Design a binder for these strands. Structure first.
Ligand SMILES: [Mg+2]
Ligand SMILES: [Mg+2]
Ligand SMILES: [Mg+2]
Ligand SMILES: [Mg+2]
Ligand SMILES: [Mg+2]
Ligand SMILES: [Mg+2]
Ligand SMILES: [Mg+2]
Ligand SMILES: [Mg+2]
Ligand SMILES: [Mg+2]
Ligand SMILES: [Mg+2]
Ligand SMILES: [Mg+2]
Ligand SMILES: [Mg+2]
Ligand SMILES: [Mg+2]
Ligand SMILES: [Mg+2]
Ligand SMILES: [Mg+2]
Ligand SMILES: [Mg+2]
Ligand SMILES: [Mg+2]
Ligand SMILES: [Mg+2]
Ligand SMILES: [Mg+2]
Ligand SMILES: [Mg+2]
Ligand SMILES: [Mg+2]
Ligand SMILES: [Mg+2]
Ligand SMILES: [Mg+2]
Ligand SMILES: [Mg+2]
Ligand SMILES: [Mg+2]
Ligand SMILES: [Mg+2]
Ligand SMILES: [Mg+2]
Ligand SMILES: [Mg+2]
Ligand SMILES: [Mg+2]
Ligand SMILES: [Mg+2]
Ligand SMILES: [Mg+2]
Ligand SMILES: [Mg+2]
Ligand SMILES: [Mg+2]
Ligand SMILES: [Mg+2]
Ligand SMILES: [Mg+2]
Ligand SMILES: [Mg+2]
Ligand SMILES: [Mg+2]
Ligand SMILES: [Mg+2]
Ligand SMILES: [Mg+2]
Ligand SMILES: [Mg+2]
Ligand SMILES: [Mg+2]
Ligand SMILES: [Mg+2]
Ligand SMILES: [Mg+2]
Ligand SMILES: [Mg+2]
Ligand SMILES: [Mg+2]
Ligand SMILES: [Mg+2]
Ligand SMILES: [Mg+2]
Ligand SMILES: [Mg+2]
Ligand SMILES: [Mg+2]
Ligand SMILES: [Mg+2]
Ligand SMILES: [Mg+2]
Ligand SMILES: [Mg+2]
Ligand SMILES: [Mg+2]
Ligand SMILES: [Mg+2]
Ligand SMILES: [Mg+2]
Ligand SMILES: [Mg+2]
Ligand SMILES: [Mg+2]
Ligand SMILES: [Mg+2]
Ligand SMILES: [Mg+2]
Ligand SMILES: [Mg+2]
Ligand SMILES: [Mg+2]
Ligand SMILES: [Mg+2]
Ligand SMILES: [Mg+2]
Ligand SMILES: [Mg+2]
Ligand SMILES: [Mg+2]
Ligand SMILES: [Mg+2]
Ligand SMILES: [Mg+2]
Ligand SMILES: [Mg+2]
Ligand SMILES: [Mg+2]
Ligand SMILES: [Mg+2]
Ligand SMILES: [Mg+2]
Ligand SMILES: [Mg+2]
Ligand SMILES: [Mg+2]
Ligand SMILES: [Mg+2]
Ligand SMILES: [Mg+2]
Ligand SMILES: [Mg+2]
Ligand SMILES: [Mg+2]
Ligand SMILES: [Mg+2]
Ligand SMILES: [Mg+2]
Ligand SMILES: [Mg+2]
Ligand SMILES: [Mg+2]
Ligand SMILES: [Mg+2]
Ligand SMILES: [Mg+2]
Ligand SMILES: [Mg+2]
Ligand SMILES: [Mg+2]
Ligand SMILES: [Mg+2]
Ligand SMILES: [Mg+2]
Ligand SMILES: [Mg+2]
Ligand SMILES: [Mg+2]
Ligand SMILES: [Mg+2]
Ligand SMILES: [Mg+2]
Ligand SMILES: [Mg+2]
Ligand SMILES: [Mg+2]
Ligand SMILES: [Mg+2]
Ligand SMILES: [Mg+2]
Ligand SMILES: [Mg+2]
Ligand SMILES: [Mg+2]
Ligand SMILES: [Mg+2]
Ligand SMILES: [Mg+2]
Ligand SMILES: [Mg+2]
Ligand SMILES: [Mg+2]
Ligand SMILES: [Mg+2]
Ligand SMILES: [Mg+2]
Ligand SMILES: [Mg+2]
Ligand SMILES: [Mg+2]
Ligand SMILES: [Mg+2]
Ligand SMILES: [Mg+2]
Ligand SMILES: [Mg+2]
Ligand SMILES: [Mg+2]
Ligand SMILES: [Mg+2]
Ligand SMILES: [Mg+2]
Ligand SMILES: [Mg+2]
Ligand SMILES: [Mg+2]
Ligand SMILES: [Mg+2]
Ligand SMILES: [Mg+2]
Ligand SMILES: [Mg+2]
Ligand SMILES: [Mg+2]
Ligand SMILES: [Mg+2]
Ligand SMILES: [Mg+2]
Ligand SMILES: [Mg+2]
Ligand SMILES: [Mg+2]
Ligand SMILES: [Mg+2]
Ligand SMILES: [Mg+2]
Ligand SMILES: [Mg+2]
Ligand SMILES: [Mg+2]
Ligand SMILES: [Mg+2]
Ligand SMILES: [Mg+2]
Ligand SMILES: [Mg+2]
Ligand SMILES: [Mg+2]
Ligand SMILES: [Mg+2]
Ligand SMILES: [Mg+2]
Ligand SMILES: [Mg+2]
Ligand SMILES: [Mg+2]
Ligand SMILES: [Mg+2]
Ligand SMILES: [Mg+2]
Ligand SMILES: [Mg+2]
Ligand SMILES: [Mg+2]
Ligand SMILES: [Mg+2]
Ligand SMILES: [Mg+2]
Ligand SMILES: [Mg+2]
Ligand SMILES: [Mg+2]
Ligand SMILES: [Mg+2]
Ligand SMILES: [Mg+2]
Lengths: 77, 100, 62, 176, 48
RNA sequence: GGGGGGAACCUGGGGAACUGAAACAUCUCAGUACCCAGAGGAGAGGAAAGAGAAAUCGACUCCCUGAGUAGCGGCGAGCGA
RNA sequence: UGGUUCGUGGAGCCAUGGGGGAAUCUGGGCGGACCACCGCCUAAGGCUAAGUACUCCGGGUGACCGAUAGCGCACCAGUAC
RNA sequence: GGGGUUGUGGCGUGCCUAUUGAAGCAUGAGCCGGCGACUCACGGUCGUGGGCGAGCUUAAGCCGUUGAGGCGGAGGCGUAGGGAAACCGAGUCCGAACAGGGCGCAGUCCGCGGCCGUGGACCCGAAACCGGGC
RNA sequence: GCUGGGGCUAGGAGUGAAAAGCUAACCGAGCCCGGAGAUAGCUGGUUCUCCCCGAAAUGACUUUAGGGUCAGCCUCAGGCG
RNA sequence: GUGGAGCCUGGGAGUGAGGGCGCGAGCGAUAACGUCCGCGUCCGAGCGCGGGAACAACCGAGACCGCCAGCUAAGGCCCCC
RNA sequence: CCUAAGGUAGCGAAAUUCCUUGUCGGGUAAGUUCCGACCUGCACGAAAAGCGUAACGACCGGAGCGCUGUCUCGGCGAGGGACCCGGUGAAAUUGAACUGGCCGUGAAGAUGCGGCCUACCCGUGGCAGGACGAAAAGACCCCGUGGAGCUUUACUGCAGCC
RNA sequence: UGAAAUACCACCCUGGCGCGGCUGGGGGCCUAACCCUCGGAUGGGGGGACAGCGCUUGGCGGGCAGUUUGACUGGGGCGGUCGCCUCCUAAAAGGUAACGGAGGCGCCCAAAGGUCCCCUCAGGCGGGACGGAAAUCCGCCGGAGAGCGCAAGGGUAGAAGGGGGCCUGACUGCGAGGCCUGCAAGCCGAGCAGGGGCGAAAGCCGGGCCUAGUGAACCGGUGGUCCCGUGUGGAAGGGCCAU
């Protein structure tokens, strides 16, 4: 007779498009709770903090020291 | 059927309106027929020369319409699509009204 | 003898010209109230996949 | 609709159209049969009790008879009005459902069993202060209290003197 | 909830609705705001 | 005149359950099994107080279509003009 | 209440156990609540071949059986038991 | 060159069923013979061999045969689709829209095989239930 | 009290000094024929040869857990390359 | 990287009791041929063959058939052998 | 404090007492039983009666006398079988058998695998340790959206009665 | 004056009589239906419009009938558990079990929502009238230990925190493209249109710092709409949108 045995259906978080991968405008690039990663160039983020491409291009992960981490998208030039 | 779940009878009957009781309202139904195919015969197409041909058949009320080019010939029908009415305005028939 | 159609289906689903099986969206019969227009609005018809193959074998004659 | 295996004294529920409150609860599972719940109850308005038994399944139907604190304001008809010193709503309780409505006081704070915003039991405190406005300065004499009721008191207790009276026995329990 | 309660909004004499959720007890005792109707555009809007 | 018999078939009077619904009760199985009365080489039905939308048809029965349609339905199972 | 696809449904139509209860063609019923138009038909008496069902019985056939099959019985079987 | 037999030598845990796993001390079988279980009807869906193709096909029946084959077009599937429907139609739905976006340009008839449905549906097996009788 | 002969009561019915006893050698509801080839998510059983490939015992939902549905894993034909 | 690889449309499945060993964890007692997951393996379906005395899953090794040829694996080389 | 009211008479380690072989007493060389008491009655109690009762009982307990093969502890003897010969001649069971022991091993209890040890072929009378011997498709146990009989303030009906 | 005040008008009560229509309750007596009886009667007694019986109503109703009485589970039962969120287990992608460890939810905010402009914390050492050990004030020191309605987690002072002004985009028609995924669902979403809010503008707004606060279909209810409306018109009843 216990008092536990509970949990929540996993949510499958994290980067969902890595640096150098080609996307299309719309692709959600990152799923995360806080803001582990922040919007960048052509990268708006959503209500739930979900970063998503804003234009067809590639993904770049700029690490900005104590300024956080960024995910940009340099469109195809 | 099965699992003992709920089939997929979860999806709903938006098919609203599908049955009163005396039954089905007896009303006139229309048969397509694109001018594209009256082009088969050249005379005076009348909804019958059609049934007998191989299109429409007993469905009753014929409504020549659609795609294809018209042809210089009289077309008696129970209806015409705005578009074919046109393509026939290129010279032909327009015996609308129809019926006694 | 002669297969019977599954009235409960024809009453809520449609076979399309392509062969597609289209059923109205589900989820807005009394949920509504605290539902974005996005949700409530997003109730158009939809594909149905892998289950239409089943779902279709019941509209046999129709 | 709560079952029984999930009762506890204090739980209030609706049985036989009436209001109760399990006051005794003991799970019973002897032999290899199915378990059984043997409780004892009390009506919320009348005192009547009744021990009963139920199987493991059987659901009961929990009720929401929370007990806020009301407040007397004024008489009217054969009723008297109170107020929940909380949301200041107005309750017109019929003299019957106001335990010891007499020996009360137009302004005293008492308790009521709110069942859907309508008290079915309005009790004051075991003893309240009241100004006797009667009695002959003459020992164990009768004394009409400011609320019209009468009570037995000693001598020294004379007109105007405010006393105490156990609202259960309406007996003089001393002076103010 | 109870103190909560559901409710919609009527275009002032007519149809349409919004259906939000008032909140009894606290800021309540009626309530109306400005919102856009399927027909024409923007107006007040009462409860009911 | 009647009475009793007759393998099925027939009409009428009564009339189940197991089953199916992956429980179950409405529903189904089915007005089937069966019981009883009667009929006869057949029985029923049959000349419109019908149909039902057609300036329409024109007793009745029977086959094929219409049609698994119209519908019916814990709108479930399924029944089905 | 029953019949119909109709499970109380907007529930007509047909039938009828109970209550009430007409008129005779300016009469009466139906066209799926109801109403008004427009139609259809003449209830509360009766009979009627033929087309249809079946196969104890006679015959004719058989990509039917050929004595553990075929009817239970090819034989003195609804028998011995 | 072969048959029969088999002394010694080497190797060697019946068969089926069911099981994670049986020689198993788990099930079934005394042995031999014969009977003994995935079919059929009407549908449906794939596939396939053919006929004919914007068309393909008849059903009851009728005439003929009497192991002879015709007729028969009622009807059926297909030529359009969308929409709950009115309706419209190579479009239409939603919409205020001339944005958007959802659905939209192929057949039939036989034979054959696979599988699904409805029937007892691969074959035996209940405890039981209901009717009428004894 | 025992006993012969003649009789009556029987199937959710009888009878019972009561045990759920007895009702034609097994009675918590007789026997026979019928509905009927009831249903059995259970146990058993399933018959000629060769050749190629060749699993699963997981997930999700399941009055689900020894059964299913979708998926995963196998296979065949057509297409792509 | 041409593989019994892949991918796409479709027909047919079976399976949805797994098991041991290794490694990483949880439950257990730093128990169990215990138990519940993960990565892998083998048995399952390789109770076919060598070694392990004998023995499904430990070591060796994936058995189309034939030969009185040869080299090797693990393991072995005093006799059984 | 609570209750509708808190078990009266009587009986009580009882066909009722868990603890329990309670504790005293009796009987006995020795008594978990028996009888008599005690009363912290786990969990008696008054017509599902309470407490007694002569008589009755193929009812159940305890004790003693008598007498015994019941026993110490077995012995002899009779007849009917058993065994032998002539006559008639079944049975369940049965995968096939060329059917040994120990120590191991193996699905964890081996005639059947390994190692070792025994062992000439075949019966007859006996014995029952094994062949997980025979017999009944476990009664127990769980499983089955199996079945029934029974119950009720489970659900829904029906007869009946109002 | 008393709890109340007083007129005049209202509405409506308590109980009362008056006409107008509408509905009932019983009391008796009768005999002839109906019932019971009587030396056998087209008759006499007794009961009597009661009962009995027919249709219909509400109820009582294990006397009887049909059935239901969940699953997981180190056997079953009893206990506990059953959906959703957070953390661990979970072996540095995702995912991953156990009657493994530990906690939450079934709500809530008309400001706790938009937007624009402002402000920066908890603590710590001083310093100060009433003043704890933090009430309010002043000075430093203090990058986040504060806060962010609630569990925990990620997040965050170059605000997601605090304050204020206007507001309500807690928009309607749409929705490219993705996440997650067996199905069904769940989640993110740029951009366009209509019509708005805030801002000088750039822009921002189709709820809430984010992960729980939930419920397929069926059957019905309310608005709306004009779509069908059983010969016609119209209703009845449906349909679609909304809830
Ligand atoms: Mg768990
Ligand atoms: Mg778990
Ligand atoms: Mg988890
Ligand atoms: Mg988690
Ligand atoms: Mg709706
Ligand atoms: Mg809309
Ligand atoms: Mg058709
Ligand atoms: Mg009949
Ligand atoms: Mg009959
Ligand atoms: Mg039944
Ligand atoms: Mg059933
Ligand atoms: Mg005749
Ligand atoms: Mg004839
Ligand atoms: Mg006749
Ligand atoms: Mg029927
Ligand atoms: Mg109904
Ligand atoms: Mg009916
Ligand atoms: Mg009538
Ligand atoms: Mg009637
Ligand atoms: Mg009439
Ligand atoms: Mg008519
Ligand atoms: Mg009429
Ligand atoms: Mg007529
Ligand atoms: Mg006649
Ligand atoms: Mg022959
Ligand atoms: Mg022979
Ligand atoms: Mg024979
Ligand atoms: Mg076998
Ligand atoms: Mg096993
Ligand atoms: Mg053996
Ligand atoms: Mg055994
Ligand atoms: Mg064996
Ligand atoms: Mg077995
Ligand atoms: Mg045997
Ligand atoms: Mg087959
Ligand atoms: Mg076929
Ligand atoms: Mg074919
Ligand atoms: Mg389009
Ligand atoms: Mg698209
Ligand atoms: Mg072809
Ligand atoms: Mg086929
Ligand atoms: Mg199939
Ligand atoms: Mg089949
Ligand atoms: Mg008889
Ligand atoms: Mg006698
Ligand atoms: Mg006799
Ligand atoms: Mg019977
Ligand atoms: Mg009886
Ligand atoms: Mg007797
Ligand atoms: Mg007997
Ligand atoms: Mg019986
Ligand atoms: Mg029985
Ligand atoms: Mg049957
Ligand atoms: Mg059978
Ligand atoms: Mg059954
Ligand atoms: Mg291979
Ligand atoms: Mg595996
Ligand atoms: Mg369920
Ligand atoms: Mg399973
Ligand atoms: Mg599958
Ligand atoms: Mg495949
Ligand atoms: Mg499993
Ligand atoms: Mg496993
Ligand atoms: Mg493994
Ligand atoms: Mg171990
Ligand atoms: Mg081992
Ligand atoms: Mg294990
Ligand atoms: Mg296996
Ligand atoms: Mg392998
Ligand atoms: Mg072996
Ligand atoms: Mg070797
Ligand atoms: Mg070896
Ligand atoms: Mg080996
Ligand atoms: Mg091996
Ligand atoms: Mg190989
Ligand atoms: Mg060598
Ligand atoms: Mg070597
Ligand atoms: Mg050597
Ligand atoms: Mg005692
Ligand atoms: Mg005594
Ligand atoms: Mg004693
Ligand atoms: Mg006792
Ligand atoms: Mg002594
Ligand atoms: Mg002595
Ligand atoms: Mg003693
Ligand atoms: Mg003794
Ligand atoms: Mg004693
Ligand atoms: Mg007693
Ligand atoms: Mg008593
Ligand atoms: Mg007695
Ligand atoms: Mg006594
Ligand atoms: Mg006696
Ligand atoms: Mg002796
Ligand atoms: Mg002797
Ligand atoms: Mg002798
Ligand atoms: Mg002798
Ligand atoms: Mg002899
Ligand atoms: Mg030997
Ligand atoms: Mg051994
Ligand atoms: Mg040996
Ligand atoms: Mg022996
Ligand atoms: Mg012996
Ligand atoms: Mg045995
Ligand atoms: Mg068994
Ligand atoms: Mg169950
Ligand atoms: Mg059952
Ligand atoms: Mg009188
Ligand atoms: Mg008389
Ligand atoms: Mg009289
Ligand atoms: Mg009289
Ligand atoms: Mg009467
Ligand atoms: Mg009644
Ligand atoms: Mg009852
Ligand atoms: Mg019962
Ligand atoms: Mg019965
Ligand atoms: Mg039944
Ligand atoms: Mg269970
Ligand atoms: Mg247990
Ligand atoms: Mg339980
Ligand atoms: Mg429980
Ligand atoms: Mg879920
Ligand atoms: Mg981790
Ligand atoms: Mg991970
Ligand atoms: Mg500070
Ligand atoms: Mg200080
Ligand atoms: Mg202070
Ligand atoms: Mg201070
Ligand atoms: Mg401080
Ligand atoms: Mg603001
Ligand atoms: Mg979209
Ligand atoms: Mg998309
Ligand atoms: Mg999906
Ligand atoms: Mg929130
Ligand atoms: Mg905010
Ligand atoms: Mg339903
Ligand atoms: Mg509705
Ligand atoms: Mg409505
Ligand atoms: Mg209209
Ligand atoms: Mg009509
Ligand atoms: Mg009409
Ligand atoms: Mg009309
Ligand atoms: Mg009019
Ligand atoms: Mg409407």
């Amino acid at each position: 007779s216990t008092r536990n045995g509970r949990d929540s259906q996993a949510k499958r978080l994290g980067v969902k498009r890595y640096e150098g991968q080609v996307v299309r405008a719309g692709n959600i690039l990152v799923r995360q709770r806080g803001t582990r990663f922040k919007p960048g160039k052509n990268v708006g983020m959503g209500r739930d903090f979900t970063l998503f491409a804003l234009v067809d291009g590639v993904v770049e992960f700029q690490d900005r020291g104590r300024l956080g981490r960024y995910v940009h998208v340099r469109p195809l030039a | 059927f099965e699992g003992g779940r709920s089939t997929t009878l979860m999806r709903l009957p938006k098919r609203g309106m599908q049955g009163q009781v005396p039954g089905e309202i007896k009303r006139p139904r229309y048969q397509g027929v694109n001018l594209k195919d009256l082009a088969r015969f050249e005379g005076e197409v009348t909804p019958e020369l059609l049934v007998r041909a191989g299109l429409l058949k007993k469905g009753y009320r014929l409504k020549i319409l659609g795609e294809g080019e018209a042809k210089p010939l009289k077309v008696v029908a129970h209806a015409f699509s705005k578009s074919a009415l046109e393509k026939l305005k290129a010279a032909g028939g327009e015996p609308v009204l129809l019926e006694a | 003898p002669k297969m019977k159609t599954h009235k409960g289906a024809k009453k809520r689903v449609k076979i399309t010209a392509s062969g597609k099986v289209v059923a109205m969206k589900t989820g807005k019969r009394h949920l509504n109230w605290q539902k974005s227009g996005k949700e409530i609005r997003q109730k158009g018809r939809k594909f149905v996949l892998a289950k239409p193959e089943a779902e279709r074998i019941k509209l046999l004659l129709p | 609709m709560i079952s029984v295996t999930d009762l506890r004294p204090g739980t209030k529920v609706k049985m036989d159209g009436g209001l109760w409150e399990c006051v005794e609860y003991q799970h019973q599972k002897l032999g290899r049969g199915g378990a059984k719940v043997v409780a004892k109850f009390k009506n919320l308005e009348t005192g009547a009790t009744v021990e009963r038994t139920f199987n493991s399944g059987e659901k009961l139907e929990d009720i929401y008879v929370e007990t806020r604190e009301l407040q007397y304001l004024y008489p009217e008809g054969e009723e008297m009005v109170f107020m929940d010193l909380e949301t200041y709503e107005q309750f017109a309780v019929p003299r019957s459902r106001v335990v010891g409505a007499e020996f009360f006081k137009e302004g005293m704070t008492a308790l009521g069993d709110m069942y859907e915003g309508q008290p079915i039991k309005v009790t004051p405190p075991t003893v309240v202060e009241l100004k006797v406005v009667d009695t002959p300065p003459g020992g164990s004499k009768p004394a009409t209290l400011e609320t019209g009721a009468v009570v037995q008191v000693p001598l020294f207790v004379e007109p105007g003197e405010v006393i105490k009276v156990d609202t259960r026995t309406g007996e003089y329990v001393g002076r103010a | 909830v109870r103190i909560k309660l559901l409710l919609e909004c009527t275009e002032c004499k007519r149809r349409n609705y919004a259906t939000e959720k008032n909140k009894r007890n606290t800021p309540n005792k009626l309530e109306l705001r400005k919102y856009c109707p399927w027909c024409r555009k923007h107006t007040v809007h009462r409860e009911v």
